[PDB]
């Protein structure tokens, strides 16, 4: 009636047993009360669904097909289930707690069609685009990872077929803020996103964290703490224009930190990025006219012994930043590269920092590499030409055909 | 009594009919209970006014003249009324919804003295400065644009004399966060602002979005999604010092993206800016000692046919970034310029990217322009001198008097 | 029972008299109900404690030793007690208000062991790290500063032995957001912080604002408004790796704006920084491999007469940015330096902007200084060598041994 709901004060269902059913029942009530689209200049204002702190099992997928639905909690509730599951089991009764908390949605769905494994599915076809759905300040917990045939401990596979929030349909002005996501194969997957804001979340110990799929425009991913798994994405986007990725602190152990396919006229600037593997920032498949500026890159070795010898399958010639596209701008970045000579792959290679594999007119200027071994600060493959490379390394450190690229060596000594 | 109010649980008035009267009545109650300024080290702590999701007509301006008032909702509620009003009317009954939603304040005021058309007016004279008023997570909707004599469709004029929030008086530590503003001639106009934060709002389809007027200090405009109209401002400030404009995604179709008059010692950095017209970033009237860094600029052509041939009246010689002032710093920006040779104005002109019209000592370094036609990457008018221009174009691309400016051409080939 | 508490609806104690006792009593209730760590895949989800707007005296320290506790209010409640206490006392009855407001915690504790003076202490030993505690949108007010033997007015000393929030123990995924802190000797002191976010706070008129002590990793300090006192820190961190400090607007009058000791592989970029003293950004004691990029620095003279002739004890040879460490990256910064020749200390010195006191391999490029007098844009002490200094000043403006540093002078005339 006033469009405000509390999942613990809804007469149908029990949010401890199946919060999915409770929230779907609330959505049915909202639709039943908000049937008319144009009464007194309104009629479908949406609603807010509140999750007090608590442990809520979700056994039924929530389907969101209305605009202006806010689902909110009172705690992102993150704790490192990765650490706990790797603590010897005999010690567990002495730990102060074992599980995540906050306003906690435990995803008890089977694997899927990865969409069928999503705790929250936002889907609606026809017009207009579903708009201004808000997810705020709650926890989504996939609980366990499971055996995947790799022979790794089940809890270290980053595999369970669960998604936190999956948006399947064209959307406008969505927000995901202050969330906690933990132990999900995919935290947050949003297709066809316009003017989306993913802001100030904690998205960690998920196989993949943020994936923007299909296409999108004018969106932003800001002020997030992000940590993925070795076969997955930390931040991924495809066929986006005008995307802004800034003020994120991305820590291990994603396959990459930022991965673009067909992303144009976007900006990946002023992020702190830390990886245990090469291929931290990948601009692929005609990723063009992007600004990659004033980021702090750190690549070093996994120190945590349960994941020692786990990697993303990419060798040190890959580059920390790899670009396949035209007319990008790579300006003012810092690269710390820490590798041991005896584990450089392939054997005896000179690791590369910035690699230009294809495209023309890439402008690379004023980048500082600090490395414990010799590196190729910039490697321009013969398939990329007419690039401009300034103050990003000495002549030895910039491997490039001087006949078809403009190179200025950083002054030395 | 506990200083928490809900507009749907206030005995006087009806928030569906006139939420303005309801909120003014609440403000009167707060003042009546909080009369003494110094009882037990306190006495005027303010209050919070909650707007549940719903459609609320405002027929009376809300006057806020107390410090520490928070007005909060549960949904920014944006949908594109611009798209809807341009969809053929016969199809409207098949649309899933027609209007914005969330915690929605429908501004049913007549035009004004633009202040008289504001849904919320913050005004108080005397001392100290009104402080720490907070606007959070609600929607302000001006409902319709109206005929303005231009012969454009009424809904495409961006003209109705309505303002969302107008702050007339000197203020300190104000916040506007998580808001939605739609279909207002002016979304948000704040005069005399100290240490203001305008953060993570969605401010779109308004004639002008953010205007900081009169003067101010130490303020910031961060993480906003902003889109204005062709005669208005996206982000505007005058006589501000120490302003930080960062992490915004500004999309069309403002006259400009960022417009400064007499703004000094401020920073416009790490924004994504997209316009359909020249004059995207304007530093005017002694705008000096500002940093304009690592922004992504895109200028291209309006693709949406209802606005085809609508422009901001400025030609391609204007520049994407135009500077009239001293000692600014323009560093690490990316400029994508997309124009068709046959529509360049004036006929046969070479479009300019960065223009220095007046002032001395401007430092312009390491800027990358990508353009489908030849451009003047930097044009230094004779009225601007003693500038330093580095790695922002070849010699041909930097039009400047070498006798009185320090120029280093980007190395070529 | 639903884990949601309101301090004005708790039967034990009176939050006006001692909110500390009320909140401790709530914490005891949470622990009593949440005793089991593993019941139905949960058991200790934590809770949320709500503070409506009001004036609450705290006479007992709150001890937080549970994970996933959120303490939230409805107003940051800042007003300038500094201005008020310096307004002649006869005029106070004509001021509209005298005190801060919002959801206000008045810290009525004696001085301490500074931890004993903290309104909120977060402490817990053993495993795992206390996690995902959230502080949101309330005000913490230390009420008065006191005589410190300096002979300054008591209210201008920035000394009272009070701390707002003190985190003593190893912590993960903490958040401090939307807070107001005022008139505390230390606003916010967090030891041993992993993946912490201090975001969008107003932390002003405190002796020191933000201190990250002991060690930490992967944390961020973003979008804050910060102003400290002349013997204290605005933003301080020690032994942190992977720290991101961005989008902050730091205004006077801290001893410094950003101070690092033993901080590595971190980023201080895209902040607006204003000081009345030298030594604005200090990288000390092996602060290495940090990016300091696209910041706007302003150093000028204190204009406010109650603090005229108060300073941080550092002379103009200190530098605005001082670096003692290896392999840092200083890129794209703007420095406005405003000093009067007659007050330069020591007499007749040429003030320095960037100083390299020790370490090797620092990369300093494309920095713009604007100064009303001649300055040493970069001073490389003999104890720092093998640095690279590009486009940060003419030859005269870069004081450095050319035999052991790579220098390119900014082109002139």
Dump the DSSP string for A2-33.
-SEEEGGG-SSS-HHHHHHHHHHHHHHHHHHH
Other beta carbons less than 10 A from residue A409's beta carbon? 15
Rounded Cα distance between A26 and C204, Å, is 43
Produce one character per residue of A298-332: b if its CB has 16 or more CB atoms within 10 Å, e if not: bbbebeeeebeebbbebebbbbbbbbbbbbbbbbb
C42 with A83: Cβ contact below 8 A: no
Rounded Cα distance between B124 and B200, Å, is 26
Resolution of the experimentally solved model in angstroms = 2.1
Rounded Cα distance between B323 and B331, Å, is 14
Three-state secondary-structure class, residue B411: coil
Beta bridge partners of C163: C118, C186
Q: Give every CB contact of residue A359 below 8 A, 6+ residues apart in sequence.
A: A286, A288, A323, A324, A325, A326, A327, A328, A384
- Establish if B95 touches chain A: CB-CB under 8 angstroms: yes
- Using the Cα atoms of residue B400, residue B401, residue B404 and residue B407 in order, give the sign of their dihedral: positive
Query: Which pairs count as long-range contacts for C109-114, CB under 8 Å and 24+ apart, including other chains?
Result: C109/C58, C109/C59, C109/C61, C109/C162, C110/C161, C111/C160, C111/C161, C111/C162, C112/C161, C114/C161, C114/C163, C114/C166, C114/C185, C114/C186, C114/C189
Which contiguous run of DSSP H or E holds residue B22?
A: helix B15-33
Three-state secondary-structure class, residue A372: coil
Contact C190, A195 (CB under 8 A): no
Contact C322, C283 (CB under 8 A): yes
Q: Which is nearest to A96 in space by CA: B359, C266, C31, B200? A: C31
C79 with B243: Cβ contact below 8 A: no
Which of the 8 DSSP states describes residue A141? E
The rounded radius of gyration (Å) of the Cα atoms in chain C is: 23
Residue B290: both structure tokens together: 């500002």
Rounded Cα distance between C201 and C187, Å, is 11
Other beta carbons less than 10 A from residue C40's beta carbon? 12
Q: Where are the alpha helices (DSSP H) in C210-347?
A: none
Chain B window 19-58: which residues touch A at a Cβ cutoff of 8 Å?
52-55, 57
For chain B, counts of helices (H) and of strands (E): 2, 41
Three-state secondary-structure class, residue A162: coil
Three-state secondary-structure class, residue C21: helix
| CB-neighbour burial class of residue B335 (10 A; exposed 0-12, middle 13-18, buried 19+) | buried
Contact C139, C90 (CB under 8 A): no
Contact B326, B362 (CB under 8 A): yes
Residue A244: both structure tokens together: 């802004």
- Establish if B177 touches chain A: CB-CB under 8 angstroms: no
Beta bridge partners of C182: C141, C204
Rounded Cα distance between C252 and C206, Å, is 11
Residue B379: both structure tokens together: 């044009």
Produce one character per residue of B16-34: b if its CB has 16 or more CB atoms within 10 Å, e if not: bebbbbbbbbbbebbeeeb
C-alpha distance from residue C187 to each of C142, C258, C310 (Å): 9, 15, 21
Rounded Cα distance between C137 and A81, Å, is 29
Strands A384-385 and B4-6, by their bridges, are unpaired
- CA within 13 Å, CB half, B65: 13
- Establish if C76 touches chain B: CB-CB under 8 angstroms: yes
Beta bridge partners of B376: B352
Cα first-last separation, chain C: 74
Chain B window 362-381: which residues touch A at a Cβ cutoff of 8 Å?
366, 368, 370
Contact B386, B361 (CB under 8 A): yes
- What length does chain A have? 413
Q: What is the DSSP string of A235-302?
A: EEEESEES-EEES-EEES-SSEEEEEES-BS-EEES-EEEESSS--EEEESS-BS-EEES-EEEE---
| Chains touching C by CB (3 or more pairs below 8 Å) | A, B
Rounded Cα distance between A385 and B392, Å, is 19
Q: Chain A: residue nearest C327 by CA?
A: A370
Which contiguous run of DSSP H or E holds residue B141?
A: strand B139-141
A196: left (phi over 0), alpha (psi -120 to 50) or beta: beta
Rounded Cα distance between A18 and A39, Å, is 35
Q: A37: which chain B residues are within 8 Å (Cβ-Cβ)?
A: 93, 95-99
Cα first-last separation, chain A: 74
Among A87, A97, A251, the residue with its CB nearest the CB of C44 is A97
Q: Which is nearest to A51 in space by CA: A140, A122, A130, A183? A: A140
Rounded Cα distance between C388 and B25, Å, is 65
Task: Say if residue A253 is preceded by a cis peptide, omega within 30 of 0.
Answer: yes
Q: Give every CB contact of residue B39 below 8 A, 6+ residues apart in sequence.
A: none
- What length does chain B have? 413
Q: Which is nearest to C247 in space by CA: B200, A135, A52? A: B200
Q: B183: which chain A residues are within 8 Å (Cβ-Cβ)?
A: none
Other beta carbons less than 10 A from residue B210's beta carbon? 28
Rounded Cα distance between B141 and B100, Å, is 7
Q: Which is nearest to C167 in space by CA: C125, C206, C202? A: C125
Q: Give every CB contact of residue B123 below 8 A, 6+ residues apart in sequence.
A: B63, B64, B65, B115, B167, B168, B169
Contact C206, C231 (CB under 8 A): no
Task: Say if residue A346 is preceded by a cis peptide, omega within 30 of 0.
Answer: yes
Rounded Cα distance between C105 and C126, Å, is 30
The rounded radius of gyration (Å) of the Cα atoms in chain B is: 23
Domain A1-413, second-level architecture: 3 Solenoid (2.160)
Beta bridge partners of B212: B190, B237
Residue A357: both structure tokens together: 């594999």
Rounded Cα distance between C5 and B214, Å, is 43
C101 with B327: Cβ contact below 8 A: no
In the block, residue with structure tokens 């693709």 = B303
Which of the 8 DSSP states describes residue C93? G
Rounded Cα distance between A21 and C142, Å, is 47
Determine phi and psi for B74, rounding to 5 degrees.
Answer: -130, 40
Which contiguous run of DSSP H or E holds residue C197?
A: strand C197-199
Q: B293: which chain C residues are within 8 Å (Cβ-Cβ)?
A: 270, 294, 332, 334
Produce one character per residue of C252-280: b if its CB has 16 or more CB atoms within 10 Å, e if not: bbbbbbbbbbbbbbbbbbbbbbbbbbbbb
Q: Which is nearest to A342 in space by CA: A284, A396, A293, A301? A: A301
Q: What is the DSSP string of B290-320?
A: -EEES-EEEE-----GGGTT---S--TTS-S
| CB-neighbour burial class of residue B67 (10 A; exposed 0-12, middle 13-18, buried 19+) | buried
Which of the 8 DSSP states describes residue A109? -
Q: Which is nearest to B140 in space by CA: B109, B177, B165, B111? A: B165
Q: How far is CA A312 from the centre of its chain?
A: 16
Other beta carbons less than 10 A from residue A358's beta carbon? 17
Q: Give every CB contact of residue B28 below 8 A, 6+ residues apart in sequence.
A: none
Beta bridge partners of A379: A355, A399
C-alpha distance from residue B204 to each of A304, B97, B145, C314 (Å): 47, 18, 13, 48
Q: Chain C: residue nearest A93 by CA?
A: C37
Structural determination approach: X-ray
Contact B337, B320 (CB under 8 A): yes
Q: Which is nearest to B268 in space by CA: B233, B236, B300, B316? A: B236
The angle subtended at Cα B188 by Cα B186 and Cα B189, nearest 5°, is 90
Determine phi and psi for A206, rounding to 5 degrees.
Answer: -120, 145
Chain C contact probe: residue of A141, A223, A224, A408 with most C CBs at under 10 A: A223
Rounded Cα distance between B138 and B101, Å, is 9
Rounded Cα distance between B358 and B286, Å, is 9
Rounded Cα distance between A231 and A310, Å, is 10
- Using the Cα atoms of residue B158, residue B159, residue B163 and residue B167 in order, give the sign of their dihedral: positive
The angle subtended at Cα A327 by Cα A322 and Cα A331, nearest 5°, is 65
Contact C268, C290 (CB under 8 A): yes
Q: Which is nearest to B47 in space by CA: B75, B25, B19? A: B25
C-alpha distance from residue C322 to each of A413, C187, C212, C288, C380 (Å): 22, 25, 20, 12, 10
Q: Where are the alpha helices (DSSP H) in A67-193?
A: 81-86
Determine phi and psi for C303, rounding to 5 degrees.
Answer: -95, -10
Other beta carbons less than 10 A from residue C90's beta carbon? 7
C-alpha distance from residue B309 to each of A173, B207, C167, C296 (Å): 27, 18, 59, 39
Residue B11: both structure tokens together: 């005995």
Cα first-last separation, chain B: 74
Three-state secondary-structure class, residue A201: coil
Determine phi and psi for C305, rounding to 5 degrees.
Answer: -65, -30
C-alpha distance from residue B53 to each of A233, B6, B139, C9 (Å): 35, 11, 9, 25
Q: Give every CB contact of residue A211 below 8 A, 6+ residues apart in sequence.
A: A186, A188, A189, A190, A233, A236, A237
Other beta carbons less than 10 A from residue B160's beta carbon? 24
In the block, residue with structure tokens 């820490």 = A338
Rounded Cα distance between C139 and A111, Å, is 45
Rounded Cα distance between A291 and A363, Å, is 10
Other beta carbons less than 10 A from residue B110's beta carbon? 10
Q: Give every CB contact of residue C392 below 8 A, 6+ residues apart in sequence.
A: C354, C364, C365, C366, C367, C369, C377, C378, C398, C410
């Amino acid at each position: 009636s006033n469009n405000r709901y509390d999942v613990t004060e809804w007469p149908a269902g029990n949010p401890a047993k199946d919060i999915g059913e409770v929230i779907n029942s609330i959505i049915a009530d909202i639709k039943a009360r908000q049937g008319a689209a144009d009464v007194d200049d309104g009629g479908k204002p949406g609603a807010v669904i509140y999750l007090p702190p608590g442990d809520y099992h979700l056994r039924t997928q929530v389907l969101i097909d209305i605009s202006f639905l806010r689902i909110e909690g009172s705690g992102h509730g993150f704790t490192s289930s990765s650490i706990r599951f790797n603590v010897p089991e005999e010690e567990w009764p002495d730990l102060h707690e074992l599980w995540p908390g906050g306003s906690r949605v435990i995803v008890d769905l089977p694997a899927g069609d990865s969409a069928a494994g999503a705790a929250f599915l936002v889907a609606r076809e026809g017009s207009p685009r579903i708009s201004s759905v808000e997810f705020s300040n709650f926890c989504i917990d996939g609980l366990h990872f499971t055996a995947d045939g790799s022979g790794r401990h089940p809890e270290n596979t980053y595999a369970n077929g669960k998604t936190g929030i999956h948006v399947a349909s064209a959307n406008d002005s969505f927000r995901v803020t202050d969330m906690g996501f933990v132990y999900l194969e995919n935290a947050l997957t949003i297709h066809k996103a316009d003017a989306l804001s993913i802001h100030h979340n904690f998205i960690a110990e998920c196989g993949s964290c943020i994936e923007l799929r299909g296409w999108g425009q004018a969106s932003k991913i800001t002020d997030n703490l992000v940590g993925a798994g070795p076969r997955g994405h930390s931040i991924y986007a495809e066929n986006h224009g005008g995307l802004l990725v800034t003020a994120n602190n991305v820590f291990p152990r994603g396959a990459s930190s930022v991965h673009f396919k067909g992303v144009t006229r976007s900006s990946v600037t002023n992020n702190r990025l830390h990886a245990f593997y090469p291929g931290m920032v990948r601009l692929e498949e005609n990723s063009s006219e992007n600004l990659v500026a004033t980021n702090h890159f750190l690549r070093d070795h996994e120190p945590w012994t349960p994941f020692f010898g786990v990697d993303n399958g990419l060798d040190d010639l890959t580059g920390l930043l790899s670009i396949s596209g035209n007319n990008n701008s790579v300006i003012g970045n810092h690269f710390s590269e820490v590798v041991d000579a005896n584990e450089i792959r392939p054997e005896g290679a000179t690791p590369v920092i910035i690699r230009l594999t294809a495209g023309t007119g890439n402008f690379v200027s004023t980048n500082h590499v600090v490395s414990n071994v010799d590196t190729q600060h910039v490697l321009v493959d013969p398939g990329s030409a007419r690039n401009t490379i300034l103050d990003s390394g000495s002549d030895t450190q910039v491997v490039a055909d001087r006949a078809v690229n403009a190179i200025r060596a950083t002054p030395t000594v």
